[PDB]
From a paper:
Chemerin functions as both an adipocytokine and a chemotactic factor and plays key roles in adipogenesis and inflammation. The chemerin receptors chemokine-like receptor 1 (CMKLR1) and G protein-coupled receptor 1 (GPR1), play crucial roles in regulating obesity, inflammation, and cancer, highlighting their potential as therapeutic targets. Although both receptors recognize the same ligand, chemerin, and share high sequence identity, they exhibit distinct signaling properties and biological functions. CMKLR1 is the canonical chemerin receptor that mediates both G protein and arrestin signaling, while GPR1 exhibits weak G protein signaling but strong arrestin-dependent and -independent internalization.
Numbering used by the authors:
A (entry chain C): 9 to 62
B (entry chain A): 6 to 41, 44 to 55, 183 to 232, 241 to 287, 295 to 354
C (entry chain R): 35 to 195, 211 to 330
D (entry chain B): 6 to 340
E (entry chain L): 22 to 37, 43 to 56, 61 to 89, 93 to 105, 109 to 117, 131 to 157
């Protein structure tokens, strides 16, 4: 019964997490991607002059 | 080209060492021990994580990998044993009166039908023959499902679980008290497997 | 008609020539890059490169034959081209023999083959094979002299119009022996031993190795018997008539050069590497 | 009693999660510019392994990388010039994980021997020597990641994650909340939190210092194989054997978007993110890997250069290139 | 010999000027019954090609022509009045097997 009590306590502890709406998190990831979009060689191609793999 | 000369030379010597190590490793024959009897005390009692055992018979260096200590899911680490030359599966004839025999049959069927062992040979060891010799005299084989007929019937049922009869061959042996017959059987099986691999490499078939 | 046989035969000369050239190029390309490194890799690579050199030096003789045997390319060009052709063909024969012997040892002696097979040994065997072929092909570069004979200059073997001589008996005989007799005997013995081992304990299920062995032996004999026996028969050329030496000898050349193109079909293209390559394509 | 209360609390959690959702990532990112076709070529290949490659890890300087193979080799390559910087033999050839220290002074390995081996690279004599051996896990170590020169985090097949002090060699913290074999590990950029997915189709987030789980996600219907934190650190992507990969948010505590296609039936072995996280790299079992648009669930591209299944892949810290290893004994660098 | 060459010369003399020639004397002779390689000088006569049918005609060109003659063929017929043009046929031999150099019909 110890395992069941521990699982119940863990689930009760996890039930008390203050969450936020999906829209705000989506906006945060969108803003991060937009901000760091210009520093992604995979997304934006890099000229071969500065490319270490040439 | 002042600092790259030393870096390139290091790569060449490391590559040479890698080639030597690969050539040395390709000279070894590998066996994977399985069972439900899992420890395979019959083959681990010779005079010589997972357990690695080395032994030389007739100028052949056999490596044996025993995986009893791996009690987790089998499907998440069995794919690491693609390159094993053969699989030694141990099953006890004396466990028929203990479900245990059914578990052994299920394990053998799961191992033999695995996609990773399509062309991997399996050597089946029917251990504890001596105890089963008189254990049958007190309890019949009907509970699980002369010693000769019962042993042959168990062996043929174990061989029936195979589905890829054309891509692999199963070797069935009755474990004896002496250790001079199991070594010979294993050597013959691995010699046959080596012949198969050499013929496949040569491209004849 | 001017020459029906020559016109009919130069076509197949050219056809087998570029067929073998393309096959050797393909097998070299696949073996060098997209295949692992083993003893069989060394054997196949060296055989392929030898056959490729043979088939790239073949067109010179093909064009020489295409112009009614008129060696107009030079006065000493056949002193090297024929030597290189002989070296390549004898190297191919020696590697076929050593491949058959290696297969026989690997089948009959699994433990020894597992314990005593390394790339260094294969490289040493290849090097000594090339060295042995060089010594036997050395007389070729010293025994080509061009004669006119009222126009249509052609180069022959014997001498110019107590050294630098062979009596036509210590050269023709030895290339016959070491080029046909020992190789076919070794190959036949090895393959018959392999077949007996396979059939003794029913090792094989499909009849692929039997067909491969029988076709290898048949093609080797058919390709290397007529040319060698005609070269040996050249000693008593004053007794036999000139019709055979004028007709069968080009046919013997065609049969001999067919083997250099048929070897990749029988040896490498039946392996798993070619199956993987064709699956990827 | 206890079971009924647990079921009621789980139902309440599910209801709260459903009520907290007001929209989905698909509609919010409907008006964004599509990525298009991300076509990468193999700018560099490394061929020094004679067995299957099971693990790889990019260096902090994005110039040296490490690879683990079943032949018993841990090879450190110079990515720029294909130079083999180092080769470490392993006591056990069965290795399925490897880690590279952020300082670059140490390397890690582990496998079926349920022992984590830490080797010192920057030695006075220049020869790599074993610096630490950790043996406290019942099952095989599936993944290991470095935090610093002193602490490491490992996960094993006995449903247990551990935090090891390399100087002492003992288990400072233990996590035993998973009911299945943990298969992947990934740490937050600040090395304070880490998510781990197990074979019971659940991914749990753990605190390095506190030592207890806070959030658990059971979106997948199959055993999780790969996990990777988002570059932001408030989200992570999990790839499993159900031919689909999902993205979860710590703050949202639930699903955001899933990436799957009809033609994909094989499982997923490795998952990684780029610098901005706009596109995701997913290695599959169908002999090639895919690049997905993380914000639109669209296949941006396909990289197909491996003769066998892709086992591991990693993106450099500066995002200059990606490295993919496979069972065909070759590792390729795509850019 | 000379009779055969002269007989063959007259036949080819009708083709080769609207007039013909007739044999007057012999300058050179000779080598076997298959090829003679004879040469002689000719001169314009009174009778022409139409009258060349009968030798009995009324019979100043210093030609001194050379015309190799083959019997048995028509392979060799010198026309200039270079020497190399006859060496290709000035053999009178047999099957080329007689002039055999070991190695022509081979790559060895």
């Amino acid at each position: 019964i110890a395992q069941a009590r521990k699982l119940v306590e863990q689930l009760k502890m996890e039930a008390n997490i203050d969450r936020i709406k999906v829209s705000k998190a989506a906006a945060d990831l969108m803003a991060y991607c937009e901000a760091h979009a210009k520093e992604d060689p995979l997304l934006t191609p890099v000229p071969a002059s500065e490319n270490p793999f040439r | 080209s002042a600092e790259d000369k030393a870096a390139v030379e290091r790569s060449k010597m490391i590559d040479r060492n890698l080639r030597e190590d690969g050539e040395k490793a390709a000279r070894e024959v590998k066996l994977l021990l399985l069972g439900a009897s899992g420890k395979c005390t019959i083959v681990k009692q010779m005079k010589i994580g997972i357990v690695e055992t080395h032994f030389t018979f007739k100028d052949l260096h056999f490596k044996m990998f025993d995986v009893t200590a791996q009690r987790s899911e089998r499907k998440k680490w069995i794919h690491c044993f693609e390159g094993v030359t053969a699989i030694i599966f141990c099953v006890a004839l004396s466990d028929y009166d203990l479900n245990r025999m059914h578990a052994s049959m299920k394990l053998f069927d799961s191992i033999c039908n695995n996609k990773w062992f399509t062309d991997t040979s399996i050597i089946l060891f029917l251990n504890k023959k001596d105890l089963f010799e008189e254990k049958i005299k007190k309890s019949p084989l009907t509970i699980c499902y002369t010693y000769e007929e019962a042993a042959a019937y168990i062996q043929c049922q174990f061989e029936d679980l195979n589905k890829r009869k054309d891509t692999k061959e199963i070797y069935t042996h009755f474990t004896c008290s002496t250790d001079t017959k199991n070594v010979q059987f294993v050597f013959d099986a691995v010699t046959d497997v080596i012949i198969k691999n050499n013929l496949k490499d040569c491209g004849l078939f | 008609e001017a020459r029906v046989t020559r016109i009919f035969l130069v076509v197949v000369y050219s056809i087998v020539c570029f067929l073998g050239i393309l096959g050797n190029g393909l097998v070299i390309i696949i073996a060098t890059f997209k295949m692992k490194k083993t003893v069989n890799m060394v054997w196949f690579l060296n055989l392929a490169v030898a056959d490729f050199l043979f088939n790239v030096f073949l067109p010179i003789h093909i064009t020489y034959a295409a112009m009614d045997y008129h060696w107009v390319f030079g006065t000493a060009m056949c002193k090297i081209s024929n030597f290189l052709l002989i070296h390549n063909m004898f190297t191919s024969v020696f590697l076929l023999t050593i491949i058959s012997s290696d297969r026989c040892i690997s089948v009959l002696l699994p433990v020894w083959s597992q314990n005593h097979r390394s790339v260094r040994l294969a490289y040493m065997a290849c090097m000594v094979i090339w060295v042995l072929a060089f010594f036997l092909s050395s007389p070729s570069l010293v025994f080509r002299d061009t004669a006119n004979l009222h126009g249509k200059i052609s180069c022959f073997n014997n001498f110019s119009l107590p050294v630098g001589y062979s009596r036509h008996m210590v050269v023709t005989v030895t290339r016959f022996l070491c080029g046909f007799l020992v190789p076919v005997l070794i190959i036949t013995a090895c393959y018959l031993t392999i077949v007996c081992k396979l059939q003794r304990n029913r090792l094989a299920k499909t009849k692929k190795p039997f067909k491969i062995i029988v076709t290898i032996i048949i093609t080797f004999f058919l390709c290397w018997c007529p040319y060698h026996t005609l070269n040996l028969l050249e000693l008593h050329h004053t007794a036999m008539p000139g019709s055979v030496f004028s007709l069968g000898l080009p046919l013997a050349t065609a049969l001999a050069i067919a083997n250099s193109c048929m070897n990749p079909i029988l040896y490498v293209f039946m392996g798993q590497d070619f199956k993987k390559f064709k699956v990827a394509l | 009693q206890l079971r009924q209360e647990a079921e009621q609390l789980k139902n309440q959690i599910r209801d709260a999660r459903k009520a907290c959702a007001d929209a989905t990532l698909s509609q919010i990112t409907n008006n964004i510019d599509p990525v298009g076709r991300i076509q990468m070529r193999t700018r560099r290949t490394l061929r020094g392994h004679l067995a299957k490659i099971y693990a790889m890890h990019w260096g902090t300087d994005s110039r040296l990388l490490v690879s683990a193979s079943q032949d018993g080799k841990l090879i450190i390559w110079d990515s720029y010039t294909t130079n083999k910087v180092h080769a470490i033999p392993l006591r056990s050839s069965w290795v399925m994980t490897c880690a590279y220290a952020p300082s670059g002074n140490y390397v890690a390995c582990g496998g079926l021997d349920n022992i984590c081996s830490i080797y010192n690279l920057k030695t006075r004599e220049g020869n790599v020597r074993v610096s630490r051996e950790l043996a406290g896990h019942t099952g095989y170590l599936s993944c290991c990641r470095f935090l610093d020169d002193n602490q490491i985090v490992t996960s094993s097949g006995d449903t247990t994650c551990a935090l090891w002090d390399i100087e002492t060699g003992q288990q400072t913290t233990t996590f035993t909340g998973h009911t299945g074999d943990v298969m992947s590990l990934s740490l937050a950029p600040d090395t304070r939190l880490f998510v781990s997915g197990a074979c019971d189709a659940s991914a749990k987030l753990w605190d390095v210092r506190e030592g207890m789980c806070r959030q658990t996600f059971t979106g997948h219907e199959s055993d999780i194989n790969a996990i990777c934190f988002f570059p932001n650190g408030n989200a992570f992507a999990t790839g499993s054997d159900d031919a689909t990969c999902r993205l979860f948010d710590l703050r949202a505590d639930q699903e955001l978007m899933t990436y799957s296609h009809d033609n994909i039936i094989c499982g997923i072995t490795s998952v990684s993110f780029s610098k901005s996280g706009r596109l995701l790299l997913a290695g599959y079992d169908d002999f090639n890997c895919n690049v997905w648009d993380a914000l639109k669930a669209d296949r941006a591209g396909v990289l197909a250069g491996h003769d066998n299944r892709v086992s591991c892949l990693g993106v450099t810290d500066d995002g200059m290139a990606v490295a993919t290893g496979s069972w065909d004994s070759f590792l390729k660098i795509w850019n | 010999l000379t009779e055969a060459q002269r007989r063959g010369l007259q036949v080819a003399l009708e083709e080769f000027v609207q007039w013909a020639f007739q044999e007057t004397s012999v300058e050179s002779a000779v080598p076997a019954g298959i090829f003679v390689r004879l040469e002689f000088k000719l001169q314009q006569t009174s009778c022409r090609k139409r009258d060349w049918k009968k030798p009995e005609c009324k019979v100043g060109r210093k030609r001194k022509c050379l015309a190799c003659i083959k019997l048995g063929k028509v392979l060799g017929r010198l026309v200039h009045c270079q020497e190399t043009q006859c060496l290709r046929v000035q053999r009178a031999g047999e099957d080329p097997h007689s002039f055999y150099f070991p190695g022509q019909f081979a790559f060895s």
